[PDB]
From a paper:
Actin is one of the most abundant proteins in eukaryotic cells and plays essential roles in various cellular activities, including locomotion, division, and transcription control. The dynamic assembly of actin is controlled by the hydrolysis of ATP, bound to the center of the molecule. Upon polymerization, actin undergoes a conformational change from the monomeric G-form to the fibrous F-form, which is associated with the flipping of the side chain of His161 toward ATP. Here, we report the crystal structures of the three mutant actins bound to AMPPNP or ADP-Pi determined at a resolution of 1.35–1.55 Å, which are stabilized in the F-form conformation with the aid of the fragmin F1 domain.
The expressed wild-type human cardiac α-actin (cWT) bound to ADP was complexed with the fragmin domain 1 (F1/cWT complex) and crystallized in the presence of phosphate. In the crystal, cWT bound to ADP and Pi, both of which were present in the crystallization drop. The network of polar interactions in the active site of cWT in the ADP-Pi state (cWT_ADP-Pi) was identical to that of sWT in the ADP-Pi state (sWT_ADP-Pi). For example, Pi is surrounded by O2B and O3B (ADP), Oε1 (Gln137), N (Gly158 and Val159), Mg2+, and several water molecules. The distance between O3B (ADP) and O1G (Pi) is 2.6 Å, which is comparable to the distance observed in sWT_ADP-Pi (2.5 Å), confirming that a short hydrogen bond formed between the nucleotide and the cleaved Pi stabilized the ADP-Pi state. Furthermore, W2 of the coordinating water molecules was hydrogen-bonded to Nδ1 of His161. In contrast, His161 in cWT_ADP-Pi adopted the gauche-plus, flipped conformation (χ1 = 61° and χ2 = −91°), as observed in sWT_ADP-Pi (χ1 = 61° and χ2 = −91°). Furthermore, the electron density corresponding to the Cζ of methylated His73 in cWT was clearly observed, and its occupancy was unity as in sWT, demonstrating that His73 was completely methylated in both the expressed and the tissue-purified actins. Consequently, the observed structural similarities between cWT_ADP-Pi and sWT_ADP-Pi can safely confirm that the ATP hydrolysis mechanism proposed on the basis of crystal structures of skeletal muscle α-actin is applicable to cardiac muscle α-actin and, therefore, testable.
Author numbering:
A (entry chain B): 7 to 160
B (entry chain A): 5 to 41, 50 to 375
The structure:
Amino acid sequence: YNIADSNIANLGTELEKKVKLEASQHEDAWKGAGKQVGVEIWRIQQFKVVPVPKKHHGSFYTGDSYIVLSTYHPKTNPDKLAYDVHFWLGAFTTQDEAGTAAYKTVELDDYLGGLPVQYREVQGYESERFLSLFPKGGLRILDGGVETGFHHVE
Amino acid sequence: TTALVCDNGSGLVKAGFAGDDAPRAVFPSIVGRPRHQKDSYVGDEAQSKRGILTLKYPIEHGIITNWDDMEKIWHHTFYNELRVAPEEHPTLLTEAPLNPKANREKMTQIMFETFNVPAMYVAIQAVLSLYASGRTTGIVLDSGDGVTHNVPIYEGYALPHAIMRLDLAGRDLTDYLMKILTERGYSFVTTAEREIVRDIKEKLCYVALDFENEMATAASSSSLEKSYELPDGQVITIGNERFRCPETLFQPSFIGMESAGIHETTYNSIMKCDIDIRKDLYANNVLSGGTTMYPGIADRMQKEITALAPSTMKIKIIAPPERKYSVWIGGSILASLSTFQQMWISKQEYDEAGPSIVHRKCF
Ligand SMILES: Nc1ncnc2c1ncn2[C@@H]1O[C@H](COP(=O)(O)OP(=O)(O)O)[C@@H](O)[C@H]1O
Ligand SMILES: [Ca+2]
Ligand SMILES: [Ca+2]
Ligand SMILES: [Mg+2]
């Protein structure tokens, strides 16, 4: 078609990135995120991004969806920070939770200037990078999970 | 404050409330008027009284071509179906990509000046479907009643140079089925009869895995034939029309279009993306929309893309069972997020900037 005359004429622009960067400033969960080397974890709970306590990192409810930010020093500079962001989808998570985890992963990527590399991690399909995040015996799958945020239309 | 999500399809309105797991109102995007030349009827009621009405779709190939009738559709959606006051509800609308810019400009104007919504946003349909599937990377094939579009998305951003669009979708397939059913001596002509054939198509059509083999099977015996009871009680029989009709998606020359088929367009879209992300796109083809509901279409897409792609390429077609509603569901999810709503156009912003603001806020 003629992209410039169309409703996708502003996709891929600095303006798109600027608008989405501003939106990411309105999520309390990202404040202070990615400031030092380590792993930060949030769980989606009825559309909200809720921190997971450090004592629970590596334990995931099979019914839920999570965002895992891994901050590390890149090979190029031992004093700077780079990011892998993994979203983990339990085998029994509901559609609202997985979709929010996906959207909010992009938003955390935006918040960090596009630097994070994204990884979709379905239970039982976790990447080598994801398996490497947790100490020996650290990755545990828990039964159950929090209730969906969806209202069910009968 | 609860946002409304309205996916205005070429064929069907899907409307409801953000946070619900399905649209609460789904009805034909049609206005009916007396066939003999109340004044008019909308939606389900026009369909019910179509015996005396001529039916018109205000949306053709994803574009609003009758704004007075589209205003009737929106009014009916708010006041008669959902029974809400639109001035109380931020509203999410949807659009196929590569629409002319003026379409969403007038959508924005009407929502604020006529319906007085407090806030609104216009989303690209395939992006909503990708999020409904729990992905940030993949390539969506969305096919409704008006448009088939391919949108590759990487880390949450659609790749505009690789977006593909074909103005060939469900309504063209219905029209083609009407045409070829005349070979059997059936005559489906009128706008009311088009709705009957649309139902035949939805109930009995399928995509053959090997078209030429299936044509031979259809001539060798009656094993593929199905019967269908018309509203007047007459029973008809259809045979190879069952799969010749959706074969048009793979062979657009069946209706005289020189276009690539949906398998080729999907492949062409992937090939317009950077080579290092192509494996991820091939493994994440997501089907969306009612015209992707034909039995056998995923298997046929798998076979055809395999023939086009490098011989070792891992290819996966994802066909969510709920994909008639995937766009709406993705909208319900995103419209439940305060950060997404932060990007919506407020009434004050519209008052000060006018319709042009939609291009600066909605991506
Ligand atoms: N089971 C089915 N098989 C084939 N086509 C279908 C099926 N169900 C719906 N359709 C077609 O899909 C279209 C409506 O689907 P939808 O995604 O709501 O379209 P739109 O968004 O354009 O209104 C119509 O062309 C309809 O006939
Ligand atoms: Ca859950
Ligand atoms: Ca990134
Ligand atoms: Mg649609």
